[PDB]
Ligand binder design. Structure first.
Ligand SMILES: Cc1cc2nc3c(=O)[nH]c(=O)nc-3n(C[C@H](O)[C@H](O)[C@H](O)COP(=O)(O)OP(=O)(O)OC[C@H]3O[C@@H](n4cnc5c(N)ncnc54)[C@H](O)[C@@H]3O)c2cc1C
Ligand SMILES: Nc1ccccc1C(=O)C[C@H](N)C(=O)O
Length: 451
């Protein structure tokens, strides 16, 4: 009676499992990793994520928001660390009282798994999808230890991440028209201990950034006052500058230390285990991957990172994946057949995914310049003034993405109109006093309707 098989008990897969099982679907969820709810003496290396209104609202629909927020650290603003000034807290939003939540990935995953099982989903861990035969609707799963399993499916949901095996298998039965846009930046995950964070008075209730042009660090807080730090830096040196910093040069921990002490002097002292973490934590790859479609008939569909890998510079990948899960469950529950459901899900979500993929790419330059043209600065100055005058019409794209549930595609479209307005108003002006705010405001209401 309405059967579904989900590959990937990650963020999207576990949430859609709950929503469907809730609705009376027979749900089986297969996961390559062990069950994180089985307590061990290990301590999780806390990947932590920014949870925004979008993501929170998706959890709210599933009745899990309260539980997740109880284990999330409130970030009331962005702490920018740049040389020559003390830490600069930029309160989020307008009233200076919007927030973003920092949630440990594993804690969130545990809560979602309990939610799925509570709803009736059956979860099987330590089983990795190897292949799919779409003519027989058969799956082949394996473990590096315990071995081989063949299973039929009725409907298959690929929630199996940026390297989706389901996506790989689908490419045969439909042209996905995939295009990968590789990212010159890699990333490295590092840690600040509770001890060091207190010693240097690092603010727990904020998102911290250390901008440095073509490379940067960010840090998100944990409940225990530790911070998870991410370094974004080129894999290799580029043609135009063959000796600029990159991972290729940082051949060991001592090299990494030299790099931090020079380029991030206030951060380095806080990274006690920099050498170890650097050598034992693998260097991550970033990329944007776009598909023309996310489903094969009514047989299988992709969502979350499986459907739309994006660069992490907007902190929205998880948020988008949770939104996807809600949308997929809604379509599966209102459709003439599964094929129509999957096509309608794709038509709804694919434009939104394209929009956040593009917006995330652009968000990099915003975070990490702190070298900005006076034109860019004047544009920002003007945009804040416009938001003040017309709070209902002019909403900074970042706020639309982060603090509202307006569809990504709409946020991009309005952001584009706002961008045009500002640039034409600011062009060939040295400063703000030459700008006629009245003329500019007139254009905001002309070109920008209320939501
Ligand atoms: C450095 C970095 C920082 C980020 N920061 C943020 C942020 O601040 N905010 C935000 O919203 N997003 C952030 N993201 C992105 C976010 O992590 C993802 O978009 C999100 O995890 C996608 O969720 P998902 O369910 O689609 O995929 P995943 O969470 O990756 O889950 C897929 C699940 O796939 C299982 N799986 C994989 N292959 C198989 C297989 N073959 N067989 C069975 N199971 C398999 C995976 O093991 C896992 O259990 C960040 C990403 C990176 C890299
Ligand atoms: N939270 C993150 C995690 C990892 C990488 C980037 C971010 C961000 O950039 C989010 C922030 N809202 C920003 O765009 O300025």
């Amino acid at each position: 009676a309405r059967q579904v098989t989900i590959i990937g008990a990650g963020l999207a897969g576990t949430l859609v499992a709950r929503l469907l099982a809730r609705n009376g679907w027979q749900v089986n969820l297969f996961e390559r990793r062990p069950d994180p709810r089985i307590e061990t003496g290990a301590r999780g290396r806390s990947i932590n994520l920014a949870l925004a209104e979008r993501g929170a609202h998706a959890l709210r629909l599933a009745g899990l928001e309260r539980e997740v927020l109880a284990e999330a650290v409130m970030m009331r603003g962005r702490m920018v660390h740049v040389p020559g000034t003390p830490p600069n807290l930029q309160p989020y939003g307008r009233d200076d009282s919007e927030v973003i939540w920092s949630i440990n990935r594993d804690r969130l995953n545990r809560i979602l798994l309990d939610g799925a099982e509570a709803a009736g989903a059956s979860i099987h861990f330590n089983l990795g999808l190897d292949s799919v035969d779409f003519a027989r609707q058969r799956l082949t799963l394996s473990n590096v230890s315990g071995e081989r399993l063949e299973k039929r499916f009725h409907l298959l949901i690929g929630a199996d991440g940026c390297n989706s095996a389901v996506r790989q298998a689908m490419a045969s039965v439909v042209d996905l028209g995939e295009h990968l846009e590789t990212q010159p930046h890699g990333y490295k995950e590092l840690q600040i201990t509770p001890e060091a964070s207190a010693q240097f008075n690092l603010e727990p209730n904020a998102l911290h950034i250390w901008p440095h042009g073509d490379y940067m660090c960010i840090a998100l807080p944990n409940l225990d006052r530790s911070f998870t730090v991410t370094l974004f830096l080129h894999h290799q040196s580029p043609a135009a500058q063959p000796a600029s910093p990159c991972f290729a040069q940082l051949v060991d921990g001592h090299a990494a230390r030299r790099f931090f002490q020079r380029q991030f002097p206030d951060l380095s002292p806080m990274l006690d285990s920099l050498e170890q973490d650097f050598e034992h934590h693998p260097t991550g790859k970033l990329a944007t991957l776009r598909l023309t479609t996310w489903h094969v008939g009514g047989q299988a569909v992709l969502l979350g990172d499986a459907a739309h890998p994006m660069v992490p510079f907007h902190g929205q990948g998880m948020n988008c994946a949770l939104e996807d899960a809600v949308a997929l469950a809604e379509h599966l529950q209102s459709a003439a057949d599964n094929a129509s459901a999957l096509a309608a899900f794709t038509a709804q979500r694919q434009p939104d995914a394209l929009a956040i993929q593009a917006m995330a790419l652009e968000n990099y330059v915003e975070m990490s310049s702190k070298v900005a043209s006076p034109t860019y600065l004047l544009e920002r100055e003007l945009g804040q003034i416009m938001a003040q005058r017309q709070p209902t019409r002019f909403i900074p794209r970042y706020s639309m993405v982060t603090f509202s549930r307006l569809p990504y595609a709409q946020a991009m479209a309005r952001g584009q109109i706002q961008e045009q307005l500002l640039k034409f108003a600011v062009a060939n002006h040295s400063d703000l006093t030459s700008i006629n705010l009245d003329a500019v405001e007139h254009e905001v209401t002309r070109c920008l309707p209320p939501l």
